[PDB]
């Protein structure tokens, strides 16, 4: 016989290997596939799909539909943001339950940009202006309008256009960031403030809500396949 030599690694079973084994049912007519709409090629594609963020996970509002309703109430112009959010995926309970986050809990790194879209859900007649602000990684949470004003911010007008889209760029030290809580690689903050205030005509309800969405971009990628499934 052809002189062959068995090297180390024979008779072992690598779960992640890729070998050609015997086919149990020879000549079996496999039913041909049809173009059923919605074929998926890669997971990153499901991320580029905007998904509503449950912002208000308060004691009573969490695990209820109210977690998705950010309400602009009738309170004083205090530079206390209406909402603030940490750009730290699994290291923050809010970005975690999004389809975006659901993809990130299966990897170790994440790169690229992300986009937060705010949709106003108030009376047509109602008008006002708000300031959506972004504070790059490592920087302290912008707690005042003036503070938040200095950095990357969009001045979103309610009166004119109903939906704001703020694309958070790639201002990161490491070429690949931690999906985990790390100070070496920590997200940043996305917060909203009252640029102006809310103006409502006649006797139209003085309290409406805003929804939030999050998704990935074409440059968004992931690595090192891991898991977390319990019993």
């Amino acid at each position, epitope marked *: 016989g052809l002189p062959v030599m068995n090297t180390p690694g024979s008779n072992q079973y690598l779960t992640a290997d890729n070998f050609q084994s015997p086919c149990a049912l020879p000549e079996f007519d496999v039913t041909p596939p049809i173009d059923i709409p919605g074929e998926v090629k890669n997971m990153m594609e499901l991320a580029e799909i905007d998904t509503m963020i449950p912002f208000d996970l*308060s*004691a*009573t509002k969490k695990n209820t539909m109210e977690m998705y309703r950010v309400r602009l*109430s009738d309170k004083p112009h205090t530079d*206390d*943001p*209406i*909402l603030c*959010l940490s750009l730290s995926p699994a290291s923050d309970p809010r970005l975690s339950h999004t389809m975006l986050g659901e993809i990130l809990n299966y990897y170790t790194h994440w790169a690229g940009s992300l986009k937060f879209t705010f949709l106003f859900c108030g009376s047509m007649m109602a008008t006002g202006k708000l300031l959506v602000s972004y504070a790059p990684p490592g920087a302290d*949470p912008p707690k005042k309008r003036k503070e938040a004003m200095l950095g990357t911010h969009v001045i979103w007008d309610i009166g004119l256009q109903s939906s704001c889209t703020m694309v958070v760029p790639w201002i990161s030290n490491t070429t690949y960031r931690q999906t985990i809580d790390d100070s070496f690689t920590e997200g940043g903050y996305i917060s909203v403030f009252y640029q102006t205030r809310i103006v409502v005509p006649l006797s139209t309800p003085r309290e409406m809500d805003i929804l939030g969405f999050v998704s990935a971009c074409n440059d968004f990628s992931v690595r090192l396949l891991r898991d977390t499934t319990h019993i």
Partner: nanobody
Amino acid sequence: QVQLQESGGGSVQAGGSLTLSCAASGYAVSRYSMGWFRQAPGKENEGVAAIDSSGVGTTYADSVKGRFTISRDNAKDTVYLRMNSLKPEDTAIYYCASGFGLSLSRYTYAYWGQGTQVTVSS
């Protein structure tokens, strides 16, 4: 998993001082702030007091201003809400939450306690 154990509740008198506390597990208390939210029977999520562990910069609600005192402990990872001089309006099931930080807003937080019932008995 981050845990906040709302401890210091009960039915005291009108003017009766009652301190509150919360054990902050899962993170370095300095990276976060900490505040308080009360909700009267069948009412809404309303703020009371909150301060940032690093800057220790105070902030109270207008109605509670004066009588309530917030103070943080970086050693025991606990907050102390000295609800002094209580009133029948202060009868609201309290809650504590770690902030990003810093101030009393709609929600603006993430980790929420179970809920301790304080009743300003009169």
